[PDB]
């Protein structure tokens, strides 16, 4: 049963990869969808056994590394944390593959697309089920490999090609730090196995623990697109929408969160790292929402929402509330995949295939089913009470105030603004696409029709999960005293109770008031008083609008300064070292020295009695001179060469 | 063979130059500044880090001999 959950998507990758030429376009897509579905049913069967019956599965294929004390096995273990992670991964992957059957039906290369999509699914299953960090790193790298091939899938497009490289290189920067953390783990503990390392967490030096997890923190930022290594995330929109619906929902963007939750037995014994995770998450929630309120591409707006929500998971980990982070991780994968799916529905429906909300407007009637999915998913994203996002996001924001520390209070306002900005950019996206006066040509609206049932079916399934799912699963992850020993919480760090009993009732509804009250005010201005949003008039507003629309000018600073100077250093080394001083102290320099010396010696070979007689008689001075003068004669001779 | 590559004169001139940058390199003040940084300054920086911590980091099975969490809480009011 465990081998079925892990390796069945890998067989689907092989079939559409090598046998796609032989089974054709139609059957290749569905056989890959068959392989993912087998993993879906296998995962659900294992979910009952693990979570509800406390049964662990472990399959040890064979040994990988056997160098003295360092022993690494090809083992996969499924426990509460691992099987919980498979629930968003495998379920959303299946509903994205089934979505891609009709979305990609016009693409000339569909066997390759479903091969990369299923290979990506297999890598993510490997990451969360490996019994040690090296097996996690194997999935960690091949997620980046598969993300590179998916983002650059349309490789004739120059933008998609450079975007796939950008995602690969930034993640490979995170991999270089993850390798160092694993090397330090072998140095301090002698092992990478979870069972060995996690037993020693209390007895290891704090500095050793801090070094390992700082390396893990840098790797986490690259994959989860936290501030500093978040530039590739919006470039990842160059891939097909099914890639976005998968990468940004239950996949690569959540890998960094998993790495930190897995390391909780170690991460709890280093407050300094947890403080950094808190602040880095808080900064990225604030910045993502502010950028998303003046963004105009529909997929970029949703992508920035993904970055904002992952930062909500980081602040939960920062206050050592790992259980809340895992629960919000599962719930977010449902209604964020829905938002990407329902965005791709609108883009396909409009016959011009625009992606700019400024070219949309008045779509609500013509595509009512697409509007309903976005509406419910946005309300779930906006943590509207009763919905799945409400049971996972409201508690995380309130936990910042429940910390009663300086950092917790600062990050509460950052989270509160991000919660308010979430409502703002959700209403703005809905107004421009659906409720605004039509900006598209009249010909677009007479042809604006809903897509087929294969596209619709996964959206309906995810729509229900975005309504009820959080309420059903809340007690497993958020219930007080619920045993989740994989996520270790130190007794000094338990704040779930003061979060639940000590907060004022004004703060219990403050995120709800600002989002609902602020959203209505924003909606009125568009419909009735749009003259306030002609920001090109005011020069200060134009500069403030331009700063956030250009994403805090980070991409410009990265390319123009860090990447330009990184390539220029190679040029300076190439010019002044390899082709420079190493040639002067090499072939070119010695050739000039040889030519100068050999030209002097060529003038001394000529048949002349007086010349050789003078040299013979001159040599007699070596007999006359005392031998201490030899080095002065040597210096004199070198002068004559010149 | 059948000359399957459409040879470009500007490509050939550019490629020939990139291979032959050594001919025009001058050991001027700009070249000397980069030579000092790459072959003297940076190696010295790594040179002093390597021997400063030569045998000064016994990090194998390093133990924790000091508490992490505070026992008592003192309010700020």
């Amino acid at each position: 049963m465990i081998l079925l959950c892990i390796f069945t998507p890998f067989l689907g990758s092989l079939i559409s990869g090598f046998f796609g030429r032989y089974i054709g376009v139609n059957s290749s897509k569905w056989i890959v969808c068959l392989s993912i579905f087998v993993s879906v049913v296998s995962t659900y069967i294992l979910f009952i056994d693990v979570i509800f019956n406390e049964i662990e599965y472990t399959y040890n294929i064979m040994n990988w590394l056997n160098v003295e004390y360092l022993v690494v096995d090809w083992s996969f273990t499924i426990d509460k944390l691992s099987v919980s992670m498979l629930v968003p991964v495998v379920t959303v992957s299946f509903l994205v593959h089934l979505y891609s059957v009709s979305y990609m039906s016009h693409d000339p290369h569909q066997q390759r697309f479903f091969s990369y999509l299923s290979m990506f699914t297999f890598a993510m299953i490997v990451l969360v089920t490996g019994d040690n960090y090296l097996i996690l790193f194997v999935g960690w790298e091949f997620i980046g490999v598969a993300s590179y091939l998916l983002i650059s899938f349309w490789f004739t497009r120059f933008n998609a090609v450079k975007s796939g490289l950008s995602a690969l290189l930034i993640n490979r920067f995170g991999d270089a730090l993850l390798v160092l953390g694993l090397s330090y783990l072998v140095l301090v503990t002698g092992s990478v196995n979870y069972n060995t390392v996690f037993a020693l967490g209390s007895y290891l030096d704090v500095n050793m623990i801090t070094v390992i997890l700082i390396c893990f923190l840098v790797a986490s930022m690259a994959k989860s697109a936290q501030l500093g290594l978040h530039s590739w995330l919006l470039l990842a929109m160059e891939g097909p929408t099914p890639v976005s619906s998968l990468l940004h929902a239950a996949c690569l963007v959540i890998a960094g969160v998993f790495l930190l939750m897995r390391s909780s037995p170690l991460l709890e014994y280093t407050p300094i790292v947890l403080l950094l995770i808190l602040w880095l998450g808080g900064l990225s929630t604030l910045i993502s929402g502010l950028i998303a309120m003046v963004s105009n591409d529909i997929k970029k707006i949703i992508a920035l929402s993904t970055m904002s929500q992952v930062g909500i998971m980081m602040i939960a980990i920062g206050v050592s509330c790992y259980n809340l982070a895992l629960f919000h991780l599962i719930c977010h994968s449902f209604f964020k995949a829905l938002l990407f799916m329902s965005a791709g529905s609108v883009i396909h429906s409009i016959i011009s295939e625009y992606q700019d909300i400024r070219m949309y407007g008045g779509f609500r009637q013509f595509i009512p089913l697409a509007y309903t999915c976005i509406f419910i998913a946005s309300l779930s994203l906006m943590a509207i009470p009763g919905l799945t996002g409400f049971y996972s996001k409201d508690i995380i924001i309130e936990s910042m105030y429940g910390e009663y520390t300086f950092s917790g209070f600062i990050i509460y306002w950052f989270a509160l603004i991000s919660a308010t900005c979430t409502s703002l950019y959700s209403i703005r996206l809905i107004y421009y696409t659906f409720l605004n006066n039509p900006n598209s040509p009249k010909y677009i609206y007479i042809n604006l029709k809903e897509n087929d049932i294969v596209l619709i079916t996964p959206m309906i399934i995810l729509t229900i999960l975005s309504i009820f799912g959080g309420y059903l699963l809340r007690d497993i992850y958020l219930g007080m005293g619920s045993p989740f020993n994989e996520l270790f919480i130190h007794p000094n760090n338990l704040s779930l109770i003061e979060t639940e009993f000590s907060l004022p009732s004004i703060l219990k509804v403050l995120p709800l008031i600002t989002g609902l009250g602020g959203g209505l005010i924003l909606l009125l201005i568009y419909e009735f008083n749009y003259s306030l949003f002609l920001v090109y008039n005011n020069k200060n507003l134009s500069k403030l609008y331009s700063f956030f629309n250009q994403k805090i000018m980070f991409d410009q600073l990265l390319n123009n300064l860090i990447l330009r100077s990184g390539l220029n250093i190679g040029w300076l080394l190439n010019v002044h070292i390899d082709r420079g001083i190493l040639q002067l102290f090499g072939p070119l320099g010695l050739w000039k020295l040889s030519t100068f010396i050999s030209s002097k010696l060529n003038k001394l070979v000529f048949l002349n009695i007086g010349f050789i007689l003078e040299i013979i008689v001159l040599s007699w001075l070596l007999i006359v001179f005392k031998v201490s003068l030899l080095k002065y004669i040597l210096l004199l001779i070198i002068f004559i060469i010149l | 063979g059948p000359h399957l590559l459409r040879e470009d004169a500007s490509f050939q001139r550019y490629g020939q130059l990139r291979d032959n940058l050594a001919t025009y390199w001058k050991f001027n003040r700009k070249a000397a500044r980069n030579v000092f940084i790459f072959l003297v300054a940076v190696p010295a920086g790594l040179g002093y880090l390597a021997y400063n911590y030569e045998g000064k980091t016994p990090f194998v099975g390093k133990r924790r001999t000091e508490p992490i969490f505070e026992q008592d809480y003192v309010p700020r009011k």
Binding site: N560, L561, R564, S565, N568, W571 | R13, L17, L21, T23, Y24
Partner: peptide, 28 residues
């Protein structure tokens, strides 16, 4: 308006290799 990237020399001397103003082809 439009400006060249950093680390682009304003002059060079590589023998008889033609000397031309640097044009960032991304802006064409």
């Amino acid at each position: 308006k439009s400006f060249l990237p950093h680390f682009i020399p304003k002059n060079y001397s590589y023998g008889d290799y033609p000397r031309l103003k640097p044009e960032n082809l991304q802006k064409r």
